[model samples]
Target: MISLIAALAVDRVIGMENAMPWNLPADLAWFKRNTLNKPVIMGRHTWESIGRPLPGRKNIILSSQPGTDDRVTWVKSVDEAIAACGDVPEIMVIGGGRVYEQFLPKAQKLYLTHIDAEVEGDTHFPDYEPDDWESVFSEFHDADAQNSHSYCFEILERR
Candidate 1:
């Protein structure tokens, strides 16, 4: 199974200048909980934005560059990343806009954090037809001392 995970604000904005505009600790924790011990595939820019391999997960980078270290696997395409995952039951497609767009059609599930505020961004989530997916779960959280914005975590499965 493949799952695409992202946190987007109103207007589908996800990143501004390669960084998230808000800091929501709860959302971060949610992301970690879901992606832990899974293979994570991401575009080069997404890898750069994160700066390092996430511990306890296999980090696969979709890039043409020919180098990789103990902590990372560099692949030229999503297919290659999927191949690298081997028998893993689930792979997490972590992103930049282009990566998300490439994997959207192939994803079986989407883990989304919907932020209530609209923020300016250079990158946005790709638009999808609402009829193709059904929401399996949703939980809303209000801003607290640890969370910068009110948001909802929604899990959608393709129909």
Candidate 2:
């Protein structure tokens, strides 16, 4: 199965200068908890944004640009990336905008953190048909000293 994991602001903005606009420790922890030790697929830009392969996960980069790294595998398409995951229970698509748009249709599940604020960003999550998915779980959290914004963690499964 292929799943997507992302944190987006109320307006659907996901990034600012290849990085997240806000710092929400709880949200970050939620992402780490879900993706740790999983096969994580991301765009080259997203890989660059993180600056290194994430620890405790199989990092797969999707890019048309040429690249080589012992810490991660590079592929040109989603199919190739998913194939690289082999028998893993789920391939996690951790993104930059282009990659998310490409995989949204095929993703079996979405692990999303909805930050309750509008943010300034050049990249945004793509719109999907609401009827195609159903939220299976959700939990809201208040903003705290450690978490800059209030947010909700939602798990949506394709219907």
Candidate 3:
């Protein structure tokens, strides 16, 4: 199955200047543990944000560029992304706005971290219609001395 993982704001903002504005340690930890050893497909800019390959996961980067390393695979289109995923039971779609939009329709599940607050951002999540998805689960979390911000973990499935 194809799954999308993202942290979005009330305004639907997903990023600003190619990176998330707030730091959520718990979210990061969750992401790291969950996505480890899985194939992760991302746009070039999303790869740039991390600056290096994430250990334990096969990083597949989609780009039209001529040359790339074994850890990074270049593909011409979204169709290629799906084809590249092959028989893996699950592939994680990590993103910037463009990549998210490309994979949104094909995604079977969504793992979202909904921020409790909103901020002006350059990149936004695709507008989700109520009819398009069924909420599977949700958990609210508050900002404490440890967590710098407040957010909720929301899981949805295509209906």
Candidate 4:
């Protein structure tokens, strides 16, 4: 099954440039632990920003152009991405606005970390109506005295 994952803000803004605007160590750990060893689909820009494939996972890049790296699979459409994943237990759709928008409708689940604060950004999360999905799991964290951001990890499933 295809699953979308991101950490977002009230404005739906997901990134300032090609990267996430804030840093949450705990959330990063959670992501690494959960997404490790899974096949991950992402836009070309997201792959470029990360600079390289993540270790222990199959990284597939969705792009019209072929990639120079042999480790990344280039796909022209979401269908190809799904096909490339085979019968893997779950495939993670990592982001870059366009990729998220295209796959959201097909995703069986969402792993979202909703930040309590907001920041100015150029890229955003896909526009989704709350009624279309149900928050099946959530855990909120308080802002650390040293950090400016606080957030909650919410696992949403399509209703």
Candidate 5:
């Protein structure tokens, strides 16, 4: 199964200037916890924002050029990304807008951090009907010291 793991604002804004608009360490922690040890696919821009490969997970970067090391495998397309994923039971697609939309239909699960703030952002998550998804897990968290905005960890499985 393929999972699209993302943190999106109320307006479906995923990022601005190659970085998330909000500072939410809690969501970051949640991301790490869930994605660790999995095969993760991401776009070149997303890799540039992160600057390094995520340790423990298989980092499959979709890049047109070759700046990647032995730590990560670089592919040029979604087909290439899937081929790089190998036989992993569940692969995680960590996005930039286009990457998410490209793989959106193929995703069987969604691990989302729904942010409460609605801000202007150049990158946005893809549109999908809520009716197609079955909410398997959901937990709301209010703003705290570590996390600036109120958020919810909503995990959905396609039904």
Candidate 6:
């Protein structure tokens, strides 16, 4: 199974010039908690934004460049990324806009953070038909000193 994780603003903005536009520490914690032990797949741009491999997880990055280490495996395409994670119970897709768009169609689960603010950004999460998935879990985190914007954590599974 393929699961995707992302944090998007109310306007669906996922990034502002390769970084998140909002300050939500709680969301970061949430992300780490969910992805800590899972193998993660991401595009080259997402890899650049992170600047390093996520510790405790096998990082499968989609890139045509010549790069490989004990911490990361570089693949050329989305299909290759999936194939690289052979026999895993579930693989997580961590993203930038283009990567999210490419994987959305095949994703079996989605862990979405819907930040309740309209922030300007150069990137956005791809839209999907609601009928294709069903909500399986949800939680709301209100804005506070640590998290600037209120957001809802939603988990949806393909129906």
In candidate 4, which residue ranges exceed 4 Å CA deviation?
A: 145-147
Error of 1 at 25 (Å): 0.3
Best by lDDT: 1
1-159: candidate 4 lDDT, tens digit per residue: 889988888788888878776777877887888799999999999998889889988899988987778977888888998998889989999898999999988888999988877779899998898898999999988888654688889999998
Candidate 1 accuracy as lDDT: 0.91
Give Cα-based local distance difference scores for all models.
0.91, 0.90, 0.84, 0.87, 0.91, 0.88
| RMSD of each predicted structure | 1.0, 1.0, 1.4, 1.4, 1.3, 1.4
TM-score of each: 0.97, 0.96, 0.92, 0.94, 0.94, 0.94
Error of 4 at 102 (Å): 0.5
lDDT score for candidate 5 against the true structure: 0.91
Runs in model 2 with CA error above 4 Å? none
Q: Give the local distance difference test score of model 3.
A: 0.84
lDDT by residue (22-121, candidate 2, tens digit) is 8888988999999998999999989989998899999999989777786799998878988999998888999989999999988999999999988889
Per-residue lDDT of model 3, residues 4-59, tens digit only: 99888778888778778788888888788768888888888888888889888877
What TM-score does candidate 4 get on C-alpha atoms? 0.94
CA lDDT, candidate 2, residue 75: 91
Q: Pairs clashing in candidate 1?
A: none
Backbone clashes in candidate 5 total 0
RMSD of 3: 1.4
Sliding window of 10 residues with minimal summed lDDT for model 3 = 66-75
Q: For candidate 1, lDDT tens digit of each residue in 37-154?
A: 9999999898889988899999999988885665798898778889999898899999989999999999999999999887989999999889999999999988888877899999
Candidate 5 to truth, TM: 0.94
